[PDB]
Design a protein around this nucleic acid. Structure first.
Ligand SMILES: [Zn+2]
Ligand SMILES: [Zn+2]
Ligand SMILES: [Zn+2]
Ligand SMILES: [Zn+2]
Ligand SMILES: [Zn+2]
Lengths: 38, 64, 878, 101, 254, 117, 83
RNA sequence: UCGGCCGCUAAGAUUAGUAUCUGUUCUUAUCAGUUUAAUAUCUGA
């Protein structure tokens, strides 16, 4: 939904505007405070 | 290297470097010197000596 | 657009001249530096005619030149100090007729730098070492010796740097075979930069310092230093090692001083002054150049003053010391850049400007002034200048330096155009007419009184209207008044009356004795109508003292009809430095009697120097300071009809095409202005994106302007396509607050399409065909008396061929004085779209093996390369 | 809002504009943006001064008036005034302006 | 045989893993020898696929190899495929393309002038990129491009790129700022010291020491490089009460 | 001892360039003079932004880089066609003027003389 | 890393086998142009014919590349790395 | 307005640097000093 692959091959959250190296980085982010508040 | 500056270079230091570089450049470039000799109606030697004399304090005395 | 640059006439001005046996034989030659060209001259001792043996473009700025001979050597080498951060030693090869580079040692960055050596060059008199110095801080000494093969060797540089120190001059001291010594006139600026009262600067003394090179220890030591009573302008090496006392003469304002390290007392002699001199009483005197003549028996020096007088200087020595300096007036010649005494009995005087002279020294040199003669405060020695006695003129080399203005036109009705060239300088100024032909250009010279600034051709008679102006000068009326009051003061202070009557009748010609130097801010100016066929003055208007004419135009006004008017823009009481002026005037003359006589109409005052005047649409544009005004004629005045006030600094020139006006700023280059006839508005519509110190401009087409700058560059600026010149001023004046434009200037920018550094300052540019049936070229003339062209390639094939030739020659045949060619042509801006045909024609001068190597790279044969080079030359200009 | 963000945004610091009837803008970002916003524009309309980049960072009334006085005289001295500055001749070369002509 | 060399190409692709640099350097050259024999087409396809690797030693050596192939066989045969690989949404691939261009413009020198306008839009993309390496490597291209085309009237493209290089002067990352400074030294030569001085003027006396430190390190490099040329280019500074700052001789008219 | 922004704008020829932080310079008169100079280029706007230079460009699905038309019409997405791409069909891109710095939010007779025949 | 930067003399800089081809300033293998000169102090004694970059036994001449030459980086001084 | 604090780059060499998530982020009454472009930080009252 807010998961997008950038042109560099990394992943971004569209809601929080946070950069993630892999899917596991994003899934840890969704557990985090910044994603839950948004 | 003389004439470089840094974050505390003042107006006066920067301008004295430009004036000193300019006078040395005029002494070095024959046609630029010719142009000033013709404009002032002075001998080239007189022009050069007057430039050498301005090299000491080209912009007037320092601020502090 | 791609241009190729060719030189038609190489610069004729001489910056330096050295003497020596460069060929190895007993014949004495002269190597001369025109600024960017090194040239070998050989005066025939029989005829007394100077022959040029070799000229080479060095594509650099020669800043110093010296001749050296190793001990027991028979051939002199040439050492060059340049703007490349390299010292080069050259040897002339008479068999090949070329300068061979013997050594090139690198020590710093290129350009005329403040702290990188090159400005000063001194050689030990016995050839064991050379010092190269900067104006500031840095000095390098190279040891010179020979190997087993008797080939010259050069050491690593020994440094002799001191911080905060200005150098005025350096000479080698003739110590014989003792350790080499270099004398410097030095000044420390450190205390001046630290004192805000300004008192330390005023109390700063110049020092004479002697650097000794210990050959044993391999280091330069600053052995002796002594302050001076007043600042010297240069040093003379005095003969030594038992052919003289050693030490130096220091030439300073008003005095010549001899000093030597050791127990020698300093000996000082006043410089003799001309009796009844009309020069401003406040000014002092400097020697501008020296020559040494060492006969095996004796030595003398010839030194020339800035009024052109050569004095023979001899040192009287008692047991290896000097007791007195004696001065005898020798002769008056034009002010020299360099004087050189040839052992064959000839003296070569390389004029500061104008023609160079070779004299024969008929007699070796009236009162003999001396340092031993008593002199009171205010009192001085007085000599009387007189016509040539010790010298006999044998040859005169023509030089166009300085070319101040040029028009290429057919005024003679020859179908081939002539070049009408306004040459400086002062009372040695001339209008020269140059024709292509043998008597590359033949000249005829017509004298002028003051430095010609500008001239215009009257279309209906082909008469020239020349404005001549000098600073530091008296008008004829002022000089007469000054001479009457000096004769009155002579009588007041029966024998004096006879002396006064003699003085009023004595008329020393200014072309020979020089013009009297009036003070600062004193101008003399004349407007002269000259027939260009034979250069007879039809009319001469002398302007008032302290009015300086700077602009001139010939035009018709629409309201008055067919009558021709001359407008002269004059400044009133201009001080150059610091700049101030007391307003200016435009004078208006009607040019009557078939363009022969100037009949004064009116004088219109303006607030600033009207530096540029251009006929425009049956009216006139005038640039008054930084204001561009349209003026119409009127009856009592020129009437101001339109103004633009948005020009940045000062208007140096105006060119008009259609309703576009191209304005030259003194520093902010080209501004394009639209005139709206109906609205009566001058609107800036475009500008440049670079500062340029514009000297001259030429329009090439409706969108394109070629410019030259003070710094030696030529540029071509073009408006990009769909540049709209139709832009109007806001009638309410609200849009001016909102619109700020682009980069603090015009909203539209011109594009620079050509950049090239010529190497000499260009003061005229004109687009013209030089040869009938030939193609149009952009002709330019330089202040060093050089005439060149820039010609467009018509074909890609031809542009690509010459580009390839230039690429190979830049590597295979690199500039003699160690500069990189592409760097020199990109001196102020990166070169763009010009091939240097001065380099490409060096192909012909190369060794045949090198010619074969380059041509194989070009996939051509050397005759075929030479043919292509000639073909382009002949299409445009002989 | 967390205290670290309040200090980062500089909402601690308080800036006053008199053209806005002494309205206080908290933080430099809010204060440097208002000079283009409505409240400042309205205050400049009341004074009779166009809200240009000239008068950004000008908060006091007396300064904005004096600067507007300076600008108006500067722009009038910039511009071509053919009503007083064009020179005309009536008879026998008497220099007159366009009104007198 | 053509297939024999293509088998060797695959073996050479493995020799870029070698610890000794002399092997890797010799391997890179051999890729250019095969490209001269067979054709750049299939050998470049092999090299472009080796940009997807993780090892930095192996991927930099491919970028050297690609540029050698572009030097042996003129860059117009190689560039269309390198431009396409930039469209691949991977970091190491896009950085690899930029790195290949850096070496390409360094090898070809003056032949750069034919390929400036082609690469310019790609270098703008990279300089606009958030990624620091894209900006760092594209600054190295601008540096080598700039020095290659000096004296050939390509100032319009290089001044355009200066507009995307110049905002990175405030970068703190050492390899990024060293690449930017190297670009600026290169552009001083190609676009001229006047232009570079014009980019400096406003920051030399700026209030923040963040802006002056940087601007003086840049100005000092221009000054040392071009001391004599700057004489023409310094802006007019007006006289103050105590001090005269106008250079009056440059205002003389003849 | 500093000017106010109000006081500096009265003293300078270009009151609009004057910025809020300019009065805190060691020489505000020289600074505003240099900011008013023809063809000088402004300092990059982000010198005082807390965020690094382009770090704020995120959450955008920007399309893959568009190749120029002459390379696109080669059909890379024939070695003589590949030569004609660079040496015949090559067109100059839309370039930008001197001083037009990129910032994060920016993206989103009339015959000429000396012409070749 | 720190270059000597002392006035260079007549002595020619050398490179060992491993550093052969490299520019001493920018470490490029590409286009050698100008021959490297080193100072007398970097040449005197046991430092005779040693590599300008690392300091091993010299076999070939050191060159500045064309890019370093255009930039005049060959004019900066003795480029022997001392550290 | 999103700082501060606790995978990638260098044709490296055969170690140096640097992005990113997670978590934590100090409520101030009123001024002063230290500071900085400003803010913050630190230290007093
Ligand atoms: Zn999220
Ligand atoms: Zn407000
Ligand atoms: Zn060393
Ligand atoms: Zn290098
Ligand atoms: Zn080594």
């Amino acid at each position: 939904p807010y998961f997008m692959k950038n042109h560099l091959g990394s992943y971004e959250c569209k809601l929080c505007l946070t950069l993630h190296n892999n899917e596991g980085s994003y899934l840890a982010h969704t557990q985090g405070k910044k994603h839950q508040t948004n | 290297y003389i004439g470089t500056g840094h974050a505390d270079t003042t107006k006066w230091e920067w301008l004295v470097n430009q004036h000193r570089d300019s006078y040395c450049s005029y002494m070095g470039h024959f046609d630029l010197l010719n142009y000033f000799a013709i404009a002032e109606n002075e001998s080239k030697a007189r022009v050069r000596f007057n430039l050498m004399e301005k090299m000491l304090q080209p912009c007037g005395p320092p601020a502090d | 657009m791609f241009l190729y640059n060719l030189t038609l006439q190489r610069a004729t001005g001489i910056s330096f001249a050295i003497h020596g046996n460069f060929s190895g034989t007993k014949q004495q030659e002269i190597v001369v530096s025109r600024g960017k060209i090194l040239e070998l001259l050989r005066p025939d001792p029989n005829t007394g005619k100077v022959h040029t043996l070799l000229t080479v473009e060095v594509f650099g700025v020669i800043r110093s030149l010296m001749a050296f001979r190793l001990t027991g050597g028979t051939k002199d080498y040439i050492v060059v100090g340049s703007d490349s951060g390299r010292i080069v030693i050259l040897e002339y090869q008479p068999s090949k007729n070329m300068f061979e580079k013997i050594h090139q040692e690198t020590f710093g960055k290129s350009g005329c730098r403040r702290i990188v050596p090159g400005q000063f060059l001194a050689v030990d008199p016995k050839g064991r070492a050379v010092m190269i110095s900067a104006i500031e801080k840095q000095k390098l000494v190279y040891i010179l010796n020979r190997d087993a093969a008797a080939r010259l060797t050069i050491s690593s540089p020994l440094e002799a740097h001191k911080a905060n120190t200005l150098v005025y001059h350096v000479v080698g001291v003739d110590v014989g075979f003792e350790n080499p010594m270099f004398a410097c006139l030095e000044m420390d600026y450190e205390e001046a930069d630290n004192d805000p009262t300004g008192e330390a600067a005023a109390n700063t003394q110049q020092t004479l310092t002697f650097y000794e090179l210990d050959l044993g220890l391999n280091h330069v030591v600053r052995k002796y230093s002594e302050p001076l009573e007043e600042h010297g302008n240069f040093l003379i090496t005095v003969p030594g090692g038992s052919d003289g006392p050693s030490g130096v003469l220091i030439c300073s304002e008003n005095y010549i001083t001899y000093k030597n390290f050791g127990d020698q007392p300093d000996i000082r002699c006043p410089i003799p002054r001309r009796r009844n001199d009309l020069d401003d009483p406040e000014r002092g005197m400097i020697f501008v150049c020296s020559a040494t003549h060492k006969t095996k028996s004796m030595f003398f020096f010839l030194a020339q003053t800035e009024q052109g007088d050569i004095f023979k200087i001899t040192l009287e020595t008692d047991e290896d010391m000097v007791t007195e300096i004696r001065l005898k007036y020798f002769d008056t010649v034009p002010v020299a850049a360099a004087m050189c005494v040839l052992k064959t009995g000839f003296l070569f005087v390389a004029s500061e400007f104008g023609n160079h002279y070779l004299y024969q020294i008929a007699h070796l040199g009236e009162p003999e002034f001396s340092s031993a003669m008593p002199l009171e405060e205010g009192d001085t020695f007085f000599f009387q200048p007189r016509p040539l006695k010790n010298l006999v003129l044998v040859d005169e080399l023509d030089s166009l330096s300085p070319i101040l203005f040029c028009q290429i036109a057919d005024l003679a009705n020859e179908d081939t155009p002539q070049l009408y060239v306004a040459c400086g300088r002062g009372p040695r100024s001339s209008l020269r007419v140059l024709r292509h032909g043998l008597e590359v250009f033949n000249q005829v010279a017509f004298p002028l009184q003051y430095t010609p600034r500008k001239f215009v051709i009257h279309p209906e008679s082909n008469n020239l209207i020349i404005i001549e102006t000098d600073h530091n000068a008296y008008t004829e009326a002022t000089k007469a008044q000054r001479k009457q009051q000096m004769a009155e003061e002579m009588v007041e202070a029966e024998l004096a009356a006879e002396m006064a009557a003699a003085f009023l009748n004595e008329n020393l010609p200014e072309s020979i004795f020089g013009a009297p130097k009036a003070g600062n801010g004193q101008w003399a100016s004349v407007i002269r109508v000259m027939n260009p066929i034979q250069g007879n003055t039809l009319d001469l208007v002398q302007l008032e003292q302290n009015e300086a004419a700077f602009s001139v135009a010939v035009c018709r006004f629409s309201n008055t009809g067919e009558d021709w008017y001359v407008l002269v823009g004059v400044a009133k009481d201009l001080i150059l430095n610091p700049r101030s002026v007391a307003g200016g005037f435009v004078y208006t003359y009607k040019l009557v009697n078939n363009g022969e006589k100037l009949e004064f109409l009116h004088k219109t005052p303006v607030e600033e120097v009207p530096a540029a005047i251009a006929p425009f649409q049956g009216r006139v544009l005038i640039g008054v300071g930084k204001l561009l005004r349209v003026y119409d004629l009127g009856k009592k005045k020129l009437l101001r009809k339109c103004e633009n006030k948005h020009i940045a600094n000062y208007i140096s020139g105006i060119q008009t095409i259609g309703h576009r006006v191209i304005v030259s700023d003194v520093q902010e280059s080209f501004i394009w202005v639209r005139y709206k006839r109906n609205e009566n508005q001058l609107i800036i519509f475009a500008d440049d994106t670079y500062p340029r110190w514009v000297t001259t401009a030429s329009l090439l087409d409706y969108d394109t302007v070629a410019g030259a700058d003070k710094f030696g560059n030529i540029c071509v600026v073009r408006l990009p396509p769909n540049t709209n010149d139709e832009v109007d001023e806001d009638p309410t004046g609200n849009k001016a607050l909102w619109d700020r434009g682009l980069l603090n200037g015009a909203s539209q920018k011109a594009e620079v399409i050509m950049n090239y550094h010529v190497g000499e300052t260009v003061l005229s540019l004109q687009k013209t065909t030089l040869i009938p049936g030939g193609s149009e070229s952009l002709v330019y003339t330089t202040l060093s008396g050089g005439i060149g062209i820039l010609v467009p390639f018509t074909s890609h094939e031809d542009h690509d061929f010459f580009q390839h030739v230039e690429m190979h020659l830049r590597s295979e045949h690199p500039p003699l004085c160690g500069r990189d060619h592409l760097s020199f042509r990109s001196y102020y801006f990166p070169v763009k779209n010009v091939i240097d045909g001065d380099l490409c024609e060096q192909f012909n001068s190369m060794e045949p093996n090198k010619q074969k190597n380059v041509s194989e790279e070009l996939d051509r044969t050397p005759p075929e390369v030479s043919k292509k080079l000639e073909d382009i030359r002949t299409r445009y200009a002989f | 809002i967390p205290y670290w963000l309040y200090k980062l945004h500089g909402l601690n610091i308080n800036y006053n504009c008199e053209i806005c009837g002494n309205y206080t803008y908290r933080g430099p970002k809010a204060f440097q943006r208002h000079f283009a916003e409505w409240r400042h524009a309205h205050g400049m309309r009341c004074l009779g001064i166009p809200n240009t980049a000239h008068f950004a960072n000008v908060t006091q009334i007396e300064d904005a008036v004096s600067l507007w006085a300076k600008l108006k005289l500067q722009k009038a001295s910039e511009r071509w005034q053919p009503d007083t500055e064009e020179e005309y001749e009536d008879s026998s070369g008497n220099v007159v302006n366009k009104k007198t002509y | 045989s053509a297939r024999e060399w293509m088998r060797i190409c695959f073996e050479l692709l493995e020799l870029l893993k070698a610890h000794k640099k002399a092997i890797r350097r010799a391997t890179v050259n051999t890729f250019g020898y095969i490209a001269k024999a067979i054709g750049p087409h299939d050998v470049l396809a092999t090299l472009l696929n080796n940009l997807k690797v993780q090892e930095r030693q192996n991927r930099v050596c491919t970028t050297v190899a690609i540029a050698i192939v572009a030097e042996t066989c003129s860059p117009f045969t190689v560039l269309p495929a390198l431009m396409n690989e930039y469209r691949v949404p991977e970091l190491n691939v896009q950085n690899g393309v930029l790195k290949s261009l850096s070496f390409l413009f360094e090898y070809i020198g003056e032949m750069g002038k034919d390929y400036i306008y082609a690469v310019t839009p790609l270098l703008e993309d990279a300089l606009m990129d958030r990624d620091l390496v894209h900006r760092q490597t594209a600054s190295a291209v601008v540096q080598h491009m700039s020095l290659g085309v000096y004296g050939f009237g390509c100032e319009d493209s290089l001044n355009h790129l200066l507009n995307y290089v110049w905002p990175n002067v405030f970068e703190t990352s050492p390899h990024v700022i060293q690449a930017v400074m190297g670009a600026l030294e290169g552009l001083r030569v190609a676009i001229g010291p006047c232009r570079m001085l014009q980019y400096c003027l406003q920051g030399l006396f700026h209030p923040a020491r963040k802006v002056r430190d940087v601007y003086w390190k840049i100005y000092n490099s221009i000054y040392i490089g071009s001391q004599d040329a700057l004489i023409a280019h310094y802006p007019r500074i007006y006289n103050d009460d105590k001090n005269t700052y106008i250079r009056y001789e440059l205002d003389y008219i003849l | 001892n500093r000017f106010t922004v109000a006081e500096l704008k009265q003293l300078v020829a270009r009151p609009d360039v004057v910025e809020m932080h300019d009065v805190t310079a060691q020489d505000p008169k020289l600074l505003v003079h240099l900011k008013a100079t023809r063809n000088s280029v402004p300092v990059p706007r982000h010198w005082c932004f807390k965020r690094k230079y382009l770090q704020g460009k995120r959450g955008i699905e920007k399309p893959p880089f568009e190749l120029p038309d002459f390379i696109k019409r080669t059909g890379i997405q024939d070695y003589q066609k590949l030569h004609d791409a660079f040496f015949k069909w090559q067109t100059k891109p839309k370039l930008t003027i001197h001083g037009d710095l990129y910032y994060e939010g920016k993206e989103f007779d009339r015959t000429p003389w000396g012409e070749l025949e | 890393l720190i270059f000597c930067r002392k006035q260079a003399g007549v002595a020619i800089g050398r490179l060992c086998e491993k550093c052969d081809g490299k520019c001493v300033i920018c470490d490029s293998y590409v286009r050698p142009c100008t021959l490297v000169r080193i100072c007398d102090e970097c040449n005197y004694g046991s430092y005779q014919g040693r590599c300008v970059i690392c300091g091993g036994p010299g076999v070939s001449d050191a060159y500045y590349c064309k890019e370093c030459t255009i930039q005049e980086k060959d004019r900066d001084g003795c480029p022997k790395i001392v550290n």
